[PDB]
Amino acid sequence: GSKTKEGVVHGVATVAEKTKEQVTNVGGAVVTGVTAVAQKTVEGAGSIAAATGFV
Amino acid sequence: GSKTKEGVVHGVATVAEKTKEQVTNVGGAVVTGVTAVAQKTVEGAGSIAAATGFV
Amino acid sequence: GSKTKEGVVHGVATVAEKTKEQVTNVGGAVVTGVTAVAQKTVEGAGSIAAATGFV
Amino acid sequence: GSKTKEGVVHGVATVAEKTKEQVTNVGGAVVTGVTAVAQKTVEGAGSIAAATGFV
Amino acid sequence: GSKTKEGVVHGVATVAEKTKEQVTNVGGAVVTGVTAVAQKTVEGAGSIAAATGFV
Amino acid sequence: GSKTKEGVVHGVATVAEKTKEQVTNVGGAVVTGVTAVAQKTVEGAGSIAAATGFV
């Protein structure tokens, strides 16, 4: 390419006012709060916020 | 390409005022709060916010 | 291409005022709150906010 | 009062995409682009976006 | 009061994408771009975005 | 008061992408770009973004 962008996040402004935030987890998988994330994966598998319980 | 964009997030403004936020999980999978995420995957599988219970 | 966009999110403004937000999960899969997400997947499978209970 | 609001702006989300914006003024008064403004005035005169040419 | 708000702006999210923005002024008064402004004035005069040409 | 707010700005998120921004002024008054401003004035006159040409 010449002027390319791929897997790009730009120009973001975020505010989060939370008086109480609580997470309880037993034997599982919890994913919370992913923000402004970017990736590019070539010839492989790619997951951003993936939760899996058991196998 | 010449001026390309793919898998791009730009120009985002977000506000989140939450007085109480609670997550309880047992033996499963919880995904919460994904915001302004971008990826590009070539020749592979790609998932952003995927939850799976067991296998 | 020359001036392309694909899998792109731009120019977004969001507000979320929530006084109480609660998530309870047992043995399943919960996905909540995905906002302003973009991806492009080439020659592979791609899912944004997918929940699956068991296998 | 007990739970009052007066002269209040809340919960606003705005987007403005403009490719070209031009303002030319000679000897006058121009007011442009007022957004999400609040005031409360007690025992006095109050104007938000007021233009006046001469006196 | 007990739980009051007056002259308050909260919970605002704004985006402005402008490719070219130009202002030309001769001998006058120009006001442009006021956003998310609050005041409270007691026993006096109060103006937010006021333009006046001459006197 | 007990839990008061007056002349308050909170919880603001703003984005401004501008490729070219130009201001030219001769002999006047230009006010541009006021954002997230708050004041409270007691027993006096109060103006936020006020332009005046001559006197």
Side-chain angles (χ1 to χ4, degrees):
Chain A
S2 284
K3 274 176 166 292
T4 67
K5 287 195 173 195
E6 57 188 1
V8 168
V9 170
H10 77 83
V12 176
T14 306
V15 172
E17 314 195 70
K18 309 192 177 199
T19 305
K20 172 186 172 183
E21 174 176 350
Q22 165 178 340
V23 173
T24 302
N25 172 28
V26 312
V30 171
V31 174
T32 179
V34 181
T35 177
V37 172
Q39 74 172 354
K40 175 181 172 187
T41 306
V42 181
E43 293 177 350
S47 42
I48 292 288
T52 299
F54 309 149
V55 171
Chain B
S2 284
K3 274 176 166 292
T4 67
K5 287 195 173 195
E6 57 188 1
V8 168
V9 170
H10 77 83
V12 176
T14 306
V15 172
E17 314 195 70
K18 309 192 177 199
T19 305
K20 172 186 172 183
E21 175 176 350
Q22 165 178 340
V23 173
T24 302
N25 172 28
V26 312
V30 171
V31 174
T32 179
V34 181
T35 177
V37 172
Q39 74 172 354
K40 175 181 172 187
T41 306
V42 181
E43 293 177 350
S47 42
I48 292 288
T52 299
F54 309 149
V55 171
Chain C
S2 284
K3 274 176 166 292
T4 67
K5 287 195 173 195
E6 57 188 1
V8 168
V9 170
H10 76 83
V12 176
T14 306
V15 172
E17 314 195 70
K18 309 192 177 199
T19 305
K20 172 186 172 183
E21 174 176 350
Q22 165 178 340
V23 173
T24 302
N25 172 28
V26 312
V30 171
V31 174
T32 179
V34 181
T35 177
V37 172
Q39 74 172 354
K40 175 181 172 187
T41 306
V42 181
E43 293 177 350
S47 42
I48 293 288
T52 299
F54 309 149
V55 171
Chain D
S2 284
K3 274 176 166 292
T4 67
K5 287 195 173 195
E6 57 188 0
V8 168
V9 170
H10 76 83
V12 176
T14 306
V15 172
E17 314 195 70
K18 309 192 176 199
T19 305
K20 172 186 172 183
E21 175 176 350
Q22 165 178 340
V23 173
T24 302
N25 172 28
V26 312
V30 171
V31 174
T32 179
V34 181
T35 177
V37 172
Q39 74 172 354
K40 175 181 172 187
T41 306
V42 181
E43 293 177 350
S47 42
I48 293 288
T52 299
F54 309 149
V55 171
Chain E
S2 284
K3 274 176 166 292
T4 67
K5 287 195 173 195
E6 57 188 1
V8 168
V9 170
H10 77 83
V12 176
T14 306
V15 172
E17 314 195 70
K18 309 192 177 199
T19 305
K20 172 186 172 183
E21 174 176 350
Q22 165 178 340
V23 173
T24 302
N25 172 28
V26 312
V30 171
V31 174
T32 179
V34 181
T35 177
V37 172
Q39 74 172 354
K40 175 181 172 187
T41 306
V42 181
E43 293 177 350
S47 42
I48 293 288
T52 299
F54 309 149
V55 171
Chain F
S2 284
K3 274 176 166 292
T4 67
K5 287 195 173 195
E6 57 188 1
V8 168
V9 170
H10 77 83
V12 176
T14 306
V15 172
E17 314 195 70
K18 309 192 177 199
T19 305
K20 172 186 172 183
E21 175 176 350
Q22 165 178 340
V23 173
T24 302
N25 172 28
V26 312
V30 171
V31 174
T32 179
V34 181
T35 177
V37 172
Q39 74 172 354
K40 175 181 172 187
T41 306
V42 181
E43 293 177 350
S47 42
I48 293 288
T52 299
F54 309 149
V55 171

